[PDB]
């Protein structure tokens, strides 16, 4: 779960 | 504005050109440079280099269509002749730093693709970069930055036979030992040691040269230049750099590097290091030697 991940 | 508008005019024209299939892409790059060549000297600093990189990408694209198109080796010869003429147009505009680096990228691609008569193309591009380095560059930190690209580029090459690898090999060492300052000479000569060790020619079945004696000749010659240096800071700073260079080949199983050579240098650094000014420069030089000793332990 990367902090961006849009 | 002429500078910025032209940087992004070809940038779009290269992204919009990937839509073109390889046979049509060449026809367009040829009319692109005809359009972008009318701009002038201070303009073509920013349009022609992207066309040269699009030329290198095109030659790789033809190698993908090797089994589909049997005239692909003639096409690659035509592109590198297009790039040679496009980069030569930048030299007439009184440039040296950029065309030299473009000629290095062309010799790299030619050796990687492998079309017929590619060794000659890679040699002409390399020798042309040497011509710009010798005839058009004379600033110690700009020379050092130019020759370290030539060496690093030549280090990765593997397409030259021994009859062509040896002149370039001894040309890099000659131009490195003749830089403007002794500290820059010591760095460039010690950097040339990777050419004799990890450089590949087409006579060894694709294997590395591993010339252990020549690897030492550079480092022995690099220490000689280090003694005659100019600043006791830069002198010891170069003594520690050459020490790590010995450790590199020592760990790469170079027979000619013995622990006696290492101990001779760590003692020489132990003697001259206290004879420096107390500064930020020599504090980092102290930590550098501390890390080197910690790695050897």
């Amino acid at each position: 779960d990367d902090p961006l991940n849009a | 504005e002429d500078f910025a508008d032209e940087q992004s005019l070809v940038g779009r024209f290269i992204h919009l050109l990937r839509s073109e299939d390889p046979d049509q892409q060449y026809l367009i790059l040829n009319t692109a440079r005809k359009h972008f060549g009318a701009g002038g000297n201070q303009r073509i600093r920013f349009t022609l280099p992207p066309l040269v990189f699009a030329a290198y990408q095109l030659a790789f694209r033809y190698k993908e269509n090797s089994k589909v198109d049997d005239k692909w080796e003639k096409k690659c010869q035509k592109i590198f002749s297009f790039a040679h003429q496009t980069i030569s147009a930048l030299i007439k505009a009184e440039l040296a730093e950029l065309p030299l680096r473009l000629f290095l990228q062309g010799a790299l691609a030619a050796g990687e693709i492998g079309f017929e008569n590619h060794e000659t193309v890679a040699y002409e591009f390399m020798s042309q970069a040497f011509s710009l380095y010798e005839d058009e560059i004379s600033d110690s930190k700009a020379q050092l930055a130019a020759i370290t690209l030539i060496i690093g580029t030549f280090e990765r090459m593997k397409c030259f036979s021994e009859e062509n690898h040896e002149p370039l090999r001894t040309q890099c060492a000659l131009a490195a030992s003749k830089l403007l300052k002794k500290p820059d000479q010591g760095r460039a000569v010690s950097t040339c040691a990777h050419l004799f060790w990890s450089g590949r020619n087409t006579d060894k079945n694709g294997e590395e040269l591993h010339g252990g004696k020549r690897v030492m000749e550079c480092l022995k010659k690099a220490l000689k230049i280090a003694n005659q240096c100019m600043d006791p800071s830069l002198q010891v700073q170069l003594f520690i750099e050459i020490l790590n260079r010995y450790i590199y080949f020592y760990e790469k199983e170079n027979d000619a590097v013995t622990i006696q050579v290492l101990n001779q240098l760590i003692q020489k650094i132990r003697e001259d290091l206290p004879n420096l000014e107390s500064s930020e420069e020599t504090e980092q030089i102290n930590k550098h030697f501390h890390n080197t000793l910690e790695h050897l332990r």
Binding site: - | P50, Q57, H288
Partner: protein, 182 residues
């Protein structure tokens, strides 16, 4: 604390802009620090980076026209002493022993190199090494299948978590590698 690691855009020499999905993810107000390996190679990409974060560090690439960029840089982010260099000065290119040689010189916990245009992230000799690759997926003569990629570091006290973002086809795909300082 989270850092963006990218470089080797080669705009406009080899590309024109980042991929569409990369420009959507990279938006201001979300990242604190940015460490760039170099090769932008113009102010048009610099000014775009300065609007993504306040603290942006850039070293000089082999095709950068701006001499004001330093050859290398050592910066501290939290507990980690991080060294920044483009990596065209590291001979042989992408060599492991030549990179660890520079880690001894800078005395850094993490070393950032970028010339390869190949993403790498690994631990060696209890030291961490990053290569974000070309964020634009730019042309490289020695590697033919370039994957546009950058790296996001999530630093917390004595632990770093690196996220690699890659454009594989049309999709953006993420992997995670973690490193703890000894």
């Amino acid at each position: 604390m989270l850092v963006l690691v990218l470089g080797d855009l080669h705009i406009p020499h080899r590309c024109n802009s980042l991929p569409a999905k990369f420009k959507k993810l990279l938006v201001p107000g979300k990242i604190q620090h940015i460490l760039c390996t170099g090769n932008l190679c113009t102010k048009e990409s610099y000014d775009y980076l300065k609007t993504l974060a306040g603290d942006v560090h850039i070293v000089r690439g082999d095709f950068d026209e701006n001499l004001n960029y330093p050859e290398q840089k050592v910066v501290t982010v939290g507990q980690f002493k991080i060294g920044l260099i483009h990596g065209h000065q590291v001979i042989p290119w992408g060599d492991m022993a030549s990179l660890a040689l520079l880690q001894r010189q800078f005395d850094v916990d993490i070393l950032i190199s970028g010339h390869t245009h190949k993403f790498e992230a690994f631990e060696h000799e209890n030291k961490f090494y990053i290569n974000p690759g070309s964020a634009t997926g730019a042309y490289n003569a020695l590697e033919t299948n370039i994957i546009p990629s950058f790296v996001l570091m999530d630093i917390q006290a004595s632990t770093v978590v690196t996220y690699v973002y890659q454009l594989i086809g049309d999709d953006v795909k993420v992997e995670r590698i973690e490193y703890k300082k000894p």
